[PDB]
Amino acid sequence: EGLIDTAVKTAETGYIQRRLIKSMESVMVKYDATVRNSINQVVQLRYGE
C-alpha cells in the first residue's frame, strides 16, 4: 500500500502544483509596494498585509 501511494499520489499533486503556478505566475510586488497581477489589478495593497 505504501508503494502504491508513492506511485499514485504524484500525478495529482504535480497537477495541483502546475495549476497554482499558472494561476499566480505574474503576481508581483510593484514599486508602489502594491501587489498586482499582469492586468495591473490590485490584489493586495501591501504584501502579506
Binding site: 510593484k30 514599486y31 508602489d32 509596494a33 502594491t34 498586482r36 495591473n40
Partner: protein, 82 residues
C-alpha cells in the same frame, strides 16, 4: 511625475544590485573607463563591485510605476544593503 517627491524606497533592491553589477561588469569588459583605483584586480565583476561600494557606478535606475510614470534614481543616491 515630479522629481522633488520621489516615493519609491531609497534602498536599492536585490534585483537592481544584480543587474547594475552585471551591466557595469560588461561595460568594463568592453573597455569602459573605470571610476576607481584598482589594487591590480582584473575581473570585470570584481571591479564593478568595487565601484558599487565606492558609489562610483555611472548608471541611472529608471523605476517605472504601475500608472506608467517613472522615477530616475542614481546608483549613488540609493542605500546599498550588501
Amino acid at each position: 511625475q515630479a522629481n522633488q517627491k520621489r516615493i519609491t524606497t531609497p534602498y536599492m533592491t536585490k534585483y537592481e544590485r544584480a543587474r547594475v553589477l552585471g551591466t557595469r561588469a560588461l561595460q568594463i569588459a568592453m573597455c569602459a573607463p573605470v571610476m576607481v583605483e584598482l589594487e591590480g584586480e582584473t575581473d570585470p565583476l570584481l571591479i564593478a563591485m568595487k565601484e558599487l561600494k565606492a558609489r562610483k557606478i555611472p548608471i541611472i535606475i529608471r523605476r517605472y510605476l504601475p500608472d506608467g510614470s517613472y522615477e530616475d534614481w542614481g546608483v549613488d543616491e540609493l542605500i546599498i544593503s550588501d
